[PDB]
Amino acid sequence: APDSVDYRKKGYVTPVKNQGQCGSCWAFSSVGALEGQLKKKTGKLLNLAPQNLVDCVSENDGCGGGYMTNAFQYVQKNRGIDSEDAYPYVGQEESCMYNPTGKAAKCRGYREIPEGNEKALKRAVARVGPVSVAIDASLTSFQFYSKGVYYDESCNSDNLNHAVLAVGYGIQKGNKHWIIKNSWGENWGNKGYILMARNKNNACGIANLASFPKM
């Protein structure tokens, strides 16, 4: 693996979205990972539809929350996921409105990073593309993040409560980090992004529930 990777520089990452009041972080994380793979395989960067996942993944809970792996499994079984343009995000759960005519990506399964293993997570990011990850994002320190590499000793890996997207990793002024795309809009963090401590004893549980789709 390279010392640093940033998939934004390769055009693998769509603009930061805002999930609003709906608990659809998992859907944004999932589409982000699918978007990276779609770009890598086909050359196309496009917004995929988190609404498609919110409404149609029966083993998730819509705006009540969900798992990224359930979303990948759905896309595989469904034989597709719609584009954002074809199935727009409305910020609350609707009836399933999937239409194969608006299909923009497929999924051939998924893979899980060995739990707790940041080296494996780094290898996955390097070899595959953006990876879906789960973190404890409950702390005010996370809410108020602005610059530098984020670390809070109170972050609790038993409290995985938020899904985001690891789009790269590197080092800033000697501090190793993960480059994380959030779905809280561009006015949160650094234009919607946060640098989170890497190789610091699995800070915030970042390597505890990481996964990526096959395509």
Ligand SMILES: *C(=N)C1(NC(=O)[C@H](CC(C)(C)F)N[C@@H](c2ccc(-c3ccc(S(C)(=O)=O)cc3)cc2)C(F)(F)F)CC1
């Ligand atoms: C995101 N806005 C949000 N967090 C989550 O959705 C998190 C994300 C992780 C996976 C930590 F990255 N997941 C939560 C969650 C997972 C599953 C369900 C769920 C409930 C009920 C059903 S059902 C309809 O009864 O089959 C299915 C799935 C809810 C929440 C977490 F609890 F953290 F695991 C804040 C919401």
